[PDB]
Write a protein that binds this ligand. Structure first.
Ligand SMILES: *[C@@H]1O[C@H](CO)[C@@H](O)[C@H](O)[C@H]1NC(C)=O
Ligand SMILES: *[C@@H]1O[C@H](CO)[C@@H](O)[C@H](O)[C@H]1NC(C)=O
Ligand SMILES: *[C@@H]1O[C@H](CO)[C@@H](O)[C@H](O)[C@H]1NC(C)=O
Ligand SMILES: *[C@@H]1O[C@H](CO)[C@@H](O)[C@H](O)[C@H]1NC(C)=O
Ligand SMILES: *[C@@H]1O[C@H](CO)[C@@H](O)[C@H](O)[C@H]1NC(C)=O
Ligand SMILES: *[C@@H]1O[C@H](CO)[C@@H](O)[C@H](O)[C@H]1NC(C)=O
Ligand SMILES: *[C@@H]1O[C@H](CO)[C@@H](O)[C@H](O)[C@H]1NC(C)=O
Ligand SMILES: *[C@@H]1O[C@H](CO)[C@@H](O)[C@H](O)[C@H]1NC(C)=O
Ligand SMILES: *[C@@H]1O[C@H](CO)[C@@H](O)[C@H](O)[C@H]1NC(C)=O
Length: 549
């Protein structure tokens, strides 16, 4: 018969497909269609590797502008595309990757490179044995002959990226049981009525769904759980109205905002905001009243966000907490595509972030973030914590691997660990005025450990002490290479700041740096400025920065 895709649905492997898959690299795909990579084909086989059957795994594709060329002006202007595929597994599986048909056998680099997965090359195909892990893996497959140079960085990256998201099977907490009378499973196509449903659980089963570029998934206050099934692709953005103790979004399906123009404003008919009112539609939005609320985000893949990926409403933002895992953000070519907000008590792990702005927002206390892979694009620091003075304490960011960076200039506020200026007086985050700080607030007990930057990289840190700093320690951080010196992006700095009202000097205390390597050079105090390129530490703080071995 006519060739058909064959997907896996067993206790060891699960892959899916979309019959309305559309190969398109220039315009918006049809409503009921899903942009599919015409360059990469993926099949997965549960080990042991035998002449047995290999199952197809749909390869998604996100492109800058989302086919809207009059939208490219809001991207960094590169011609890079991002393809990806996800699958669930419970046992070691071999991933077979194929291309065009005129493609020669090219070498591939897996990122993070720490994975060290077995890689075989056979007849214009790449065989990657992916080991099973209760936390799955998120990695980039980069074909040498597909690498290009991004100006002015010169960063060598894939023109056509391919991401693989191998996740563990879903449990009773992340996958609703079918047939519950208190849940509603909207059929494929335009989705309507979820904003007034009496259901408490929205279930999107395999299939394509879409709100428009002029409407999003507002869930009734009654809704506390949104599930995107593996094989489900939903075009829209979600907003809970519920103020219950917990609201949840799970499943390994896709939530794509490809239909919204950049900075789409719900209050202005989803049109580009009138004047940067910071009302660009978020992919994850919620609201809390007087009671605390936990936001659970699990397994979902968010693509093409039209603005900041997430933000909650309220005056009691410290009453919110997050629990996210096995979550991904791909195809975020638009600017200001911030990663999630991590409210007090948050625990985030095994996340993949493709972002053109503030990545890890360290704005709240008692936060734990680990096992993150970041494909930072061209703006904002990897880690941000400097738009507004605040009291923040007890933060741990461990095992973070920035696989790529493509900064252009200083105005991009580059750097791994950054803290831009006070947005109230320097909205763009850059200004010589360092006298708008608050000597009454302090950020303390901060630990950034096991950070890693592959390829060329920006400065280790560019921190503006807008409030006091105390007990901040960097442990094990390696920068494979620095970006071109001429672009003003590799030197770290930390200028003395002053209180806005009192004029009192902002203090920095116990800022330690341990295990900092640049290439094959282990940095130390007598190495700081030489290789480490740490030149900007203000003499007033020099005594507070310690290079311990
Ligand atoms: C197999 O996977 C499909 C989606 O690809 C899912 O809808 C279905 O429930 C699975 N079959 C079962 C019940 O094992
Ligand atoms: C994409 O941009 C790269 C440089 O960033 C360039 O080398 C490549 O030719 C471009 N794609 C094409 C084939 O137009
Ligand atoms: C519910 O959503 C629809 C879809 O756009 C919208 O037209 C309607 O005004 C909304 N009703 C509510 C709950 O305000
Ligand atoms: C952080 O945790 C500590 C102790 O667990 C607690 O005293 C403090 O209030 C917390 N801060 C916030 C903003 O939740
Ligand atoms: C400091 O932060 C760490 C996070 O690694 C936490 O385990 C510890 O309890 C905090 N200690 C203080 C000062 O409460
Ligand atoms: C910025 O610094 C200047 C000192 O040069 C100070 O007078 C001003 O109040 C600060 N912030 C602003 C622009 O309000
Ligand atoms: C710091 O606290 C003092 C005393 O309450 C106050 O006068 C001053 O304005 C505060 N500084 C800032 C940055 O608000
Ligand atoms: C720092 O790196 C060393 C070498 O791999 C490792 O043994 C140690 O546990 C790391 N420390 C932290 C902060 O995890
Ligand atoms: C980079 O910085 C140097 C010194 O700070 C400056 O002279 C140069 O103009 C900057 N390059 C540009 C234009 O980005």
């Amino acid at each position: 018969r006519e060739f058909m895709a064959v997907t896996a649905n067993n206790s060891q492997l699960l892959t899916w497909w979309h019959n309305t898959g559309e190969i398109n690299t220039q315009t918006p795909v049809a409503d009921g269609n899903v942009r599919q990579s015409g360059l990469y084909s993926v099949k997965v086989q549960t080990t042991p590797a035998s002449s047995s059957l290999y199952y197809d795994s749909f390869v998604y594709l996100a492109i800058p502008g989302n086919g809207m060329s009059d939208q490219l002006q809001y991207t960094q202007g590169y011609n890079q595309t991002q393809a990806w595929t996800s699958f669930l597994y419970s046992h070691d599986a071999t991933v077979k990757i194929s291309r065009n048909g005129s493609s020669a056998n090219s070498n591939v680099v897996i990122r993070p490179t720490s994975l060290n997965f077995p890689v075989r090359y056979d007849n214009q195909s790449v065989y990657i044995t992916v080991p099973y892990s209760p936390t799955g893996y998120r990695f980039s497959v980069e074909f040498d002959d597909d690498l290009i140079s991004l100006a002015p960085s010169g960063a060598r990256q894939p023109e056509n990226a391919l991401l693989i998201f191998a996740s563990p099977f879903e449990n009773s907490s992340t996958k609703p049981q079918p047939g519950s009378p208190n849940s509603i499973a909207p059929a494929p196509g335009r989705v309507l009525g979820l904003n007034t449903t009496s259901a408490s659980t929205v279930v999107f089963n395999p299939g394509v769904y879409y709100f428009t570029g002029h409407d999003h998934m507002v869930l009734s206050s009654s809704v506390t759980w949104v599930y995107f099934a593996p094989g489900a692709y939903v075009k829209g953005a979600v907003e809970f109205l519920s103020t219950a103790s917990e609201v949840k979004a799970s499943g390994h399906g896709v939530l794509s905002g490809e239909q919204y123009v950049w900075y789409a404003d719900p209050d202005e008919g989803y049109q580009k905001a009138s004047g940067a009112n910071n009302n660009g539609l978020r992919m994850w939005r919620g609201t809390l009243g007087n009671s605390s609320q936990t936001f659970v985000l699990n397994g979902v893949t968010v693509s093409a966000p039209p603005f900041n990926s997430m933000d909650w409403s309220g005056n009691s933002l410290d009453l919110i907490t997050c629990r996210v895992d096995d979550y991904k953000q791909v195809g975020a070519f638009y600017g200001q595509t911030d990663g999630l907000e991590m409210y007090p008590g948050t625990i985030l792990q095994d996340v993949f972030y493709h972002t053109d702005d503030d990545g890890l927002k360290m704005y709240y206390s008692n936060v734990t973030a680990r096992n993150i892979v970041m494909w930072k694009e061209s703006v904002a620091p990897v880690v941000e914590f400097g738009w507004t003075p605040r009291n923040t304490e007890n933060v741990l960011f461990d095992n973070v691997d920035v696989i790529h960076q493509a900064y252009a200039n200083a105005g991009n506020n580059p750097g791994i660990f950054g803290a831009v200026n006070n947005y109230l007086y320097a909205p763009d985050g850059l200004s010589s005025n360092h006298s708008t700080g608050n000597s009454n607030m302090t950020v303390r007990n901060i630990t950034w450990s096991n950070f890693r930057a592959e390829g060329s990289s920006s400065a280790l840190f560019r921190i503006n002490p807008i409030q006091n700093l105390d007990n901040i320690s960097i442990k094990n951080v390696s920068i494979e290479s620095f970006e071109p010196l001429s672009i003003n992006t590799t030197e770290s700095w930390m200028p003395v700041w002053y209180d806005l009202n009192n004029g009192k000097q902002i203090t920095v205390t116990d800022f330690s740096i341990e295990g900092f390597t640049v290439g094959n050079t282990t940095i130390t105090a007598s190495n700081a400025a030489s290789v480490g390129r740490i030149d900007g530490v203000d003499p007033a703080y020099a005594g507070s920065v310690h290079y311990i071995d």
